Amino acid sequence: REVLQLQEEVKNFITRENLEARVEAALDSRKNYNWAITREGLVVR
C-alpha cells in the first residue's frame, strides 16, 4: 500500500519537459510555512 502513494506521485515529479511551465507556475504562486499557536494549542496563521 505504501508503494502506491509515491508511485502516482511520479507524474507529479517534474521533468525536463514540465520544467518550463512548473518553474513559472511556482514563481507566480506563493507559499507560506509560518504558523503560530495559542496557550491551549490551537493553530493560528
Binding site: 508503494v3 509515491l6 508511485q7 511520479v10 515529479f13
Partner: protein, 107 residues
Amino acid sequence: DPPPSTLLKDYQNVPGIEKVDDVVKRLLSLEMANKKEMLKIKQEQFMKKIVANPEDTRSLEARIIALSVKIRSYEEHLEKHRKDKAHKRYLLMSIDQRKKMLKNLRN
C-alpha cells in the same frame, strides 16, 4: 559487492517491480540509499549461500557473517579515514570477537 541497481531489501516480495516505472526502480535501487541497505543485501546473499535455514539471526553463523560485513564496513571507513581511532578500536574488537566465536563454533 552487489550491483547498485538492485532494489532495496524490503521491496522484493511485492510483484509490482516488473510493471513499475524505471524511475521508481532507480529510486528504489540501493545506490540511492545508504550503505546500510547494501550490507543488508550482502547479509541476505550470504545467508542464502551458506546457511541452511535463512532468516535465523540467533544462529552463530548468522552472527558471524553479520560481524564480517560490519568488519568490511569498518575497514572501508578506515581506509578512507586513516585517523578514526574509535572505528579502529571497533574493528579490532570485532575481529577478536569473530575469532572467539569461530573457536566456539569449531568446538
